[PDB]
Symmetry: C2
Subunit: 209 residues, 2 copies
Amino acid sequence: DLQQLFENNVRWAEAIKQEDPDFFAKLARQQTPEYLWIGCSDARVPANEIVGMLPGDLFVHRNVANVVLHTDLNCLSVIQFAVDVLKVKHILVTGHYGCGGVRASLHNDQLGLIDGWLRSIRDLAYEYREHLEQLPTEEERVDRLCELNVIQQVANVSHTSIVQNAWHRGQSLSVHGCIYGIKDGLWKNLNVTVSGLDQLPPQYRLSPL
Amino acid sequence: DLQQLFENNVRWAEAIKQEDPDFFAKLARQQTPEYLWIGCSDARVPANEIVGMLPGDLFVHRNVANVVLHTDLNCLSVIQFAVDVLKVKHILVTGHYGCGGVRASLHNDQLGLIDGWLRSIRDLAYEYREHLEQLPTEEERVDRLCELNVIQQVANVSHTSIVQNAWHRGQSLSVHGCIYGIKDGLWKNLNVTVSGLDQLPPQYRLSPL
Ligand SMILES: [Zn+2]
Ligand SMILES: [Zn+2]
């Protein structure tokens, strides 16, 4: 039954309109979010509710296990529109504990198309195989890889020419790494924020155009 | 100031916990959403709030102008994990009026990387140039293309081997087209639902494996 979702919507919209009849009218005039959320598609991680944001506040990309690839025009279009047009001040890279995409990367089952998508997280598990092996349970390994993945994705966003050119032309722009606990509703800072070119390794820095 | 978002989160999580102290505990045990939302990244279109869903209810992919490409492992991984693993019953393709991605496709400015991303919407505008030309204002042209785009994206999802193989093996799966009014908060059905192979043109139907 899809009519519930429709009936919830009319209910939601009309409730808002009696509290502030101009809410959508004003909102529809300009898009000025300060934040881009790059997070997982997982149903248990909705961005706005988690950080208490209202419509208009958060530009959002969500994909499986919040993966950012430098050949992916899907995510890169979100990042570039966020950064070059909307000129967000902040990019919130948010992974979450118990992420099935990360977990799939740590196991050996073929899931099909998504096998390719998760390659770079599988790579991360190989890179940290000594660190992860050293952890006694599967849940610990999955959860640690989740942190590692977020931290990696933050690097990926920051190395984009999109982000570096924002900085080159003096734009205020910070990239953050957070992880959400689906078990407790808490959104945790991973303290890996990047806010400028000086924070990038020499091998990854691009010269201005 | 990002600490507000953090402070809102702790506030949100602890409020929920005093209403139902098990909410996250239960939620974290299994992911069982019935819906996949494929919508735009636009800050003024958050999925859960719009249809009144709670965490756990909606698997979500959001990208610029809700574009679904058959070479995009980003979106296709979300669709395939939704369909093959989570076995969603419904895919909600939701575009929205006043979509900048659609609008960009209708104008001639180079926006960079996102130029490639929006190619297929630009194609749609060319295909319907006679219909769209025939509309007196830019806002009408943009908004009409928005409907056309949603309708197209629904076709794209339905033609995926992911979706057809769901049907081939008897899985209940419906693809919907909706459009959200950022001006009034209303989520409208475009009445283009596809629920089976019989609804696909012969040229697009794939034989079972
Ligand atoms: Zn996940
Ligand atoms: Zn849009």
